[PDB]
């Protein structure tokens, strides 16, 4: 399939700082990667579609970038409600998801 290597496995940052999550695609996926926020005991929520397109209801601090194999999700000035898991997936081919990334303080 297409392997989405998402790094780091986990990371912690206080409230107010900028973070950059990164996702690596095995093959070419164009701009067909989406970012998902999954808070504990909840279903995933789409944040970024395309590669840089904020889904409706997504605050303006979340923002995605990248094309081809390299992608990133920068959360500028994280708040206290940004603690969750963050999954990257590709929809270029039959979907595959990254292993995930946990965000603590």
């Amino acid at each position: 399939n297409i392997v989405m290597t998402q790094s780091p496995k986990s990371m912690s940052m206080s409230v107010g700082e900028r973070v950059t999550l990164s996702c690596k695609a095995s093959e070419y996926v164009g701009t067909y990667v989406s970012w998902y926020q999954q808070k504990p005991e909840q279903s995933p929520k789409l944040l970024i579609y395309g590669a840089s397109n904020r889904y409706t209801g997504v605050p303006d601090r979340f923002t995605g970038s990248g094309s081809a194999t390299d992608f990133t999700l920068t959360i500028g000035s994280v708040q206290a409600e940004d603690l969750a898991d963050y999954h990257c997936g590709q929809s270029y081919s039959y979907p595959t998801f990254g292993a995930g990334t946990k965000l603590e303080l």
Partner: protein
């Protein structure tokens, strides 16, 4: 009178129908699902930096004004029904000249499902512009694009989407290769947005990756150049007491090199830089002259 009831269905379907207005004109964005079947990948014109392509261009959208109920679930209609309804005004951005085939009739297709979904397929040939960088010619590779989208409808009105998984939405037929000088390694698709002077438009892109075959140029330029170099160097083994013979060798080899150098470029466009073939011919000319 099954034809009569179907005629009554069709007439009730177009009553009070304004084909000037897209479905969901002021209250929704029209979503056109798109699919391409490549029946042949025409030749690549290096001189013109273009390539020809034959396709079935398939477009599907939903028109709520075209719902119907009858003894069929789909209506396979003659292609003159498409002119009576709204259809997307898709065009190829880097298209140079394309043709919508109409022998013996307009090579078109219109299926209406009873829920109002439409399938609209065309057969058409596209001459598209493929910008090429020939620094590594004749050992170069290119990604020739095919970009399409809506004319006159911005992202807020019509958006385009691949009907199936993006990686499976452009399909090339097995026997459909009209490539003489190139090899079709594969295809890639993408979607994006272009800001024009009239607004923000969705653009769908396909890249066809072509690798040039070196064989023709080997036989026609590289082997002759190596042969002339060998012949020029064979003159060393002649006796020094034969000035006319070695003079003939030198002059005729130089003349052959000049003819070959004039011949080689004639196949490529008149670019302003030196290709790999140009460097090879230059070194061969240097050896003959030396």
């Amino acid at each position: 009178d099954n034809t009569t009831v179907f005629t009554r269905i069709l007439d009730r379907l177009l009553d009070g129908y304004d084909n000037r207005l897209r479905p969901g004109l002021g209250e929704r964005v029209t979503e056109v699902k798109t699919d391409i079947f490549v029946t042949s990948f025409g030749p690549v014109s290096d001189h013109d930096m273009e390539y020809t392509i034959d396709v079935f261009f398939r477009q599907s959208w939903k028109d709520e004004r075209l719902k119907f109920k009858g003894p069929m679930t789909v209506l396979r209609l003659n292609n003159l029904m498409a002119s009576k309804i709204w259809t997307p005004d898709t065009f190829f951005h880097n298209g140079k000249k394309s043709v919508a085939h109409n022998m013996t009739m307009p090579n078109k297709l219109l299926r209406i499902t009873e829920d109002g979904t439409l399938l609209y397929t065309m057969r058409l040939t596209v001459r598209a512009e493929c910008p090429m960088h020939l620094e590594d010619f004749p050992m170069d590779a290119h990604a020739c694009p095919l970009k399409f989208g809506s004319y006159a409808y911005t992202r807020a009105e019509v958006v385009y989407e691949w009907t199936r998984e993006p990686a499976r939405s452009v399909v090339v037929a097995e026997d459909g290769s009209r490539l003489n000088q190139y090899d079709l390694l594969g295809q890639t698709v993408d979607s994006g947005i272009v800001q024009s002077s009239t607004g923000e438009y969705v653009v769908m892109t396909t890249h066809f990756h072509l690798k040039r075959k070196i064989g023709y140029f080997v036989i026609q330029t590289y082997l002759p150049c190596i042969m002339t170099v060998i012949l020029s160097q064979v003159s060393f083994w002649l006796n020094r007491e034969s000035v006319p013979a070695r003079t003939v060798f030198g002059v005729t080899t130089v003349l052959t090199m000049t003819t070959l150098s004039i011949s080689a470029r004639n196949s490529l466009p008149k670019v302003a830089y030196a290709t790999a073939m140009d460097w090879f011919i230059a070194v061969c000319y240097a050896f003959v002259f030396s």
